[model samples]
Target chain A: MEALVLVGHGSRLPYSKELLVKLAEKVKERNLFPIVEIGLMEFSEPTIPQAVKKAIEQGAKRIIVVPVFLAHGIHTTRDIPRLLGLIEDEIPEDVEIIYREPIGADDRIVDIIIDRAFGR
Target chain B: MEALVLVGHGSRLPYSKELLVKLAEKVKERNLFPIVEIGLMEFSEPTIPQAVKKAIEQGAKRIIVVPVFLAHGIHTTRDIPRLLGLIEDPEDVEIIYREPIGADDRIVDIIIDRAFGR
Candidate 1:
């Protein structure tokens, strides 16, 4: 089975976690991946490892980790991968891990940014 | 005229700024606003104040500052607003600060698309 992990840069505010959870719920509703989970880089529960473990528990043989960030930064380029053990050869032997790029300069995101600017 | 300013958390890497600039270009292409600019919180040029000032110089009566972020944090709640002078409230032009791109369905769609390698 395959799984999907949505990674976020967690915040001290409760709303940050709430938003990630809601996003995961919406992704789950699509019924694309057998397992969908959220992980935070800091300041919250379900650190990247915990989310990966959850996916493994749910019979995920291969997992795709998508950083739900707007641009590529240190968090996406360095911190998150280290947390997922992508930097080291420490990931489980049976499970395959795939890291996807962040939401960078997409037309879809352009719409949301513009809509927010217009208060839509 | 109303202008749009996209606020970003700048990074050491040039890609971050390039991404925001590209997004601003896409927004500008829509022609919804006569002025669309990008500002960085740090590690880059065109700070928030600079972007707002540019908008003002371009005859913008009203400006909307959008934090192109995934969720709320100190930057959205405190830093960016303070930089835009919203906390002190001394600007001559009207500045409307909007929330970050939080928990939107379209973002969810992007997450799904990226997860599937689309």
Candidate 2:
């Protein structure tokens, strides 16, 4: 009935896609939603629309789209939502899409930044 | 002593710059490094070179450049390091460049939390 889509800014490097896939797998493990998917904004496959369609095929009536970016930018505010058809009201009539904010300026990330700087 | 420079891909949006600055401040509060600075790859200041120079001016002999990016890409692998002069060993000061915030388990937790609206 519900699905979750984790969006990422894909890269030419393998790690970027790998990381997003890993995050999707981890989120799927939580069992929060019956279906979970990873969509790339560019430079890769399964663009946002493709991911959303996958959810629809899986019988998800409602989908939550979360951008896995560190901060807000054009990608988060404009490009991604536009790709999801949130801007033009082009979404399916029966489906509900919920867009969420990014991981901007969180205290939880501070420790990781510190640890990375310290080479931990 | 040692310094830490948090690297960010600056944006036209105010929040991108604001978030990086806040992270720099929080890292400074930890006091792990006497000098801490935020450097933008583009779209704003202080630039990577400027941030590194600031640390040097503050008497930092060794500096660590930590990218606050979620994953590794051209910006992390090429551009940022090129700007920092890590491509060539010409800088007088000792610089240690760490990986970006990649796919760590802690980050996985953060992503999960964000999905759940925590």
Candidate 3:
């Protein structure tokens, strides 16, 4: 089975965390993966390890770690991979972990901002 | 006059900075505003105030500062406002700072595309 983990740079503000949880719920509804988990890098619960473990417990053979980040900052480019590295040996040898890119300069993102600005 | 400033969390990693500049260029191509500028919160050139000043210099009466952030984190909520506060006495009078792109459905669609495109 394949699983998906959406990682976020957890924030001290309840609003940020709330947004992540809400995004995770939306991703969950899509039914992309049998297991969809949410992880916070810091200042939040369900760290990367916990999210990965949840997927594994749910019998996920392949895990895709998606960074819910706008750009390739330290958290997305460095910190997240480091955390995932630590958990490399925890999972079975057959269980594969794939790291996806951050939401970089996608034109669709610009579309969203335009709509927000113009409200059209 | 109206302008748009795309704010980004500048990075030491040149790649991140490159992406922000690319996005700014894309926004510029669309010509949503008469003037489009790029600013960095830290670790890069053309900070927020500089971007705002450029817009004002270019005859912008209403400046819209759009955050290129994934969500409303401390940088988005506290740091950015604080930075803008520093220049409040200057061209900040009519600047409209936009909210970060939170978990909006459009952003949700992009996130899904990223996950599945892989």
Using lDDT, give the best candidate's number. Answer: 1
Error of 1 at B31 (Å): 1.3
Residue A27 deviation, candidate 3, in Å? 1.2
lDDT of 1 by residue, A1-120 (tens): 999998888888877788889999998888888899999889999888899999998899999999988888888888988888778534678999999988888888888887888788
What's the ranking of the predictions by TM-score, best on top?
A: 1, 2, 3
Off by over 4 Å in 2: B88-92
Fnat of each candidate: 0.87, 0.78, 0.62
- Which has the greatest TM-score? 1
Number of the top DockQ candidate:
1
- Candidate 1 off by > 4 Å: B89-92
Models 1 onward score TM values of 0.95, 0.94, 0.91
| Candidate 3 ranges beyond 4 A from true positions | A86-89, B86-93
Model 2 over residues B1-84: C-alpha lDDT tens digits? 899999899988887789999998888787778999999998999988999999999999899999999888889888987887
Global Cα lDDT for candidate 3 = 0.81
| Order by lDDT, highest first | 1, 2, 3
Per-candidate iRMSD: 1.1, 1.2, 1.7
Residue A120, model 1: Cα distance from true site in angstroms:
1.2
For lDDT, candidate 1 versus 3, the one ahead is 1
After TM-score superposition, the amount by which residue B82's alpha carbon in candidate 3 deviates from its true location, in angstroms, is 2.5
